[PDB]
Amino acid sequence: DRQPLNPANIEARHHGVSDVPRLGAMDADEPLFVDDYRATDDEWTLQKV
Amino acid sequence: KRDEKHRHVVNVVLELPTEISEATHPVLATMLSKYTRMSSLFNDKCAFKLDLLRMVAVSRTRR
Amino acid sequence: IEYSLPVPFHRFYSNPTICAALSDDIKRYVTEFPHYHRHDGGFPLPTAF
Amino acid sequence: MSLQFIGLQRRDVVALVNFLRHLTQKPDVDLEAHPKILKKCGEKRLHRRTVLFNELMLWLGYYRELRFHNPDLSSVLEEFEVRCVAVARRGYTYPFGDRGKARDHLAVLDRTEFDTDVRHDAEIVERALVSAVILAKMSVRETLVTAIGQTEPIAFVHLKDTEVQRIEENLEGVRRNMFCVKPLDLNLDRHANTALVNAVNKLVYTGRLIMNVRRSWEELERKCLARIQERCKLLVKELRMCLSFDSNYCRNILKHAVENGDSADTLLELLIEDFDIYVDSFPQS
Amino acid sequence: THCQENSETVALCTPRIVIGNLPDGLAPGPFHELRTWEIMEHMRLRPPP
């Protein structure tokens, strides 16, 4: 949105369970359903290159 | 009673035809108690179908 | 993974990406100091070694 | 405030909830120093998954209670900062051995104000503390560690032994309980020394107290995070044998990560949100 | 090398045991490659098998 999503109240995502809001919140801009911060620097570099 | 309420859910919201209901489906029979406490969001009927699909997916997963 | 204990002990045979994949304390130590991921040399051996 | 256990009578669960309600009015705020509370969890009485789930819910509620108590030190941090400014103001008007070393350490002591998070808090107060004690050792003209690579031991310079026994007693009692902050019930001032020495002794008291409360906090958080990680991994490996809708659903709930505080709180909410859905594959009596 | 034992900065000598332990700025890699080719030719192995 117009604001940077540095507040960590924004991002969360429940995966593989019954979460009818996060499906209903598709095409919404704020909450940014992301899986995990699994991307360490090795695969981050590999993704980049 | 709540039987007609579940019927209203599975016909208006979830849009199922008359073959599948609570008798032939235990996973739907467990998930309707989740769905009935979500009074709003009943205009987005597609998300309810999708969550029903993924509940059938977790019903038949092998990992 | 539970049964293999990591032992980097020589000038050779001290791979961080093996040892970080096997324990937590190595995996914390490389993700905070990313330059110690390099196999050029001084990925720091223990003070016994 | 919903912490539904599965395999006990109501007396045990009201004892647990009124222990978490009465945690701050109790010394030794810990679980490992209170084995009766985990003894009430239901070990050697029920099966594996149910007692392991109850232990997981107990540890997660303990994390919730700690994360709710919100260990405040803001006025204490402003008191530390104004003591830092007092030390900095009184350090300029004093004749030292060399001007350069004490001047640079005093500049770094004037550049160690605060931080907003907790991760840089400990480093700020230890840097201020080592510059403070090095100023104290220059001002009293005692020796210092001249070993390069070695740092200065943080201590109190020229304190009477009854007073330093009182201070070590209180600052070790603050590690047992870290919510009832008692900032110097008795006075540490003394006319018998330099005002710089009294100012740096007040500063090192405040700094060692702040370091003690933060290290006790983060050690308890690390212990509780390790416990919920072990419990969730053991539960998902124990749930791996049986396969159903219930078992795979609860497995999929416990597949989430636990390494953050808010992650564990959302895990607690996700466990208690559909408590009747995964309740069937858990055995009972 | 200058080391540090316990609050002191005593010095420390040691024998370089092998000729490889010379630094690269005094003995680089391709010098050792030419050296190995010399030993290869000296023992009738200038074509390696």
> What number of other Cβ atoms are within 10 A of residue C42's Cβ?
10
Interface mutation target, options A14, A33, A36, A38, chain D, most CBs of D under 10 Å:
A14
- How many whole angstroms separate alpha carbon B38 and alpha carbon D142? 72
State which residue of chain C sits closest to A39, comparing Cα positions.
Answer: C31
> Residues of A numbered 4-43 whose beta carbons fall under 8 angstroms of chain C's beta carbons: which are they?
40-42
The answer to whether the beta carbons of residues D237 and D47 sit under 8 Å apart is: no
CB contact under 8 A, D243 and B62: yes
Give chains near B: 3+ CB pairs under 8 A: A, D
**Method for this entry:** cryo-EM
A20 close contact with D: CB closer than 8 A:
no
Amino acid making up residue E44: R
Residue in D258, D256, C39 with CA at minimum distance from that of residue C19:
C39
Task: Indicate the burial class of D57 (C-beta count within 10 angstroms; 0-12, 13-18, 19 or more).
Answer: buried
Kindly report the length of chain B: 63
**Cβ contacts of residue D2 below 8 Å, gap of 6+?**
D272
Contacts of residue E8 in chain D, CB cutoff 8 Å?
Answer: 147
Residue in C23, C18, C9, C11 with CA at minimum distance from that of residue C37:
C18
Min Cα separation A18/chain B (Å): 6
- Give the residue carrying structure tokens 């290869």: E40
Indicate contact of B with A: 3+ CB pairs under 8 A. yes
- How far, rounded to the nearest angstrom, does the alpha carbon of residue D166 sit from its chain's CA centroid? 22
The answer to whether the beta carbons of residues D136 and D196 sit under 8 Å apart is: yes
Indicate contact of D with E: 3+ CB pairs under 8 A. yes
State which residue of chain B sits closest to D253, comparing Cα positions.
Answer: B58
Measured CA distances, C41 to C13, C34, C35, E30 (Å) = 11, 14, 11, 20
- Give the residue carrying structure tokens 């370091």: D211
Contacts of residue B38 in chain A, CB cutoff 8 Å?
Answer: 20
The answer to whether the beta carbons of residues D117 and D88 sit under 8 Å apart is: no
**Cβ contacts of residue D112 below 8 Å, gap of 6+?**
D84, D124, D125, D127, D128, D131
> What number of other Cβ atoms are within 10 A of residue D53's Cβ?
26
The answer to whether the beta carbons of residues D198 and D237 sit under 8 Å apart is: no
- How many whole angstroms separate alpha carbon D50 and alpha carbon D9? 14
What sign results for the dihedral spanned by CA atoms D126, D131, D134, D136? negative
Interface mutation target, options D237, D239, D249, D276, chain B, most CBs of B under 10 Å:
D249
Interface mutation target, options C33, C37, C38, C43, chain A, most CBs of A under 10 Å:
C37
Measured CA distances, D231 to D54, D104, D186, D211, D246 (Å) = 10, 50, 44, 30, 19
- Give the residue carrying structure tokens 């004037």: D110
Tokens standing for residue D250: 């609860």
CB contact under 8 A, D148 and E8: no
Min Cα separation C34/chain A (Å): 8
- How many whole angstroms separate alpha carbon D246 and alpha carbon D250? 6
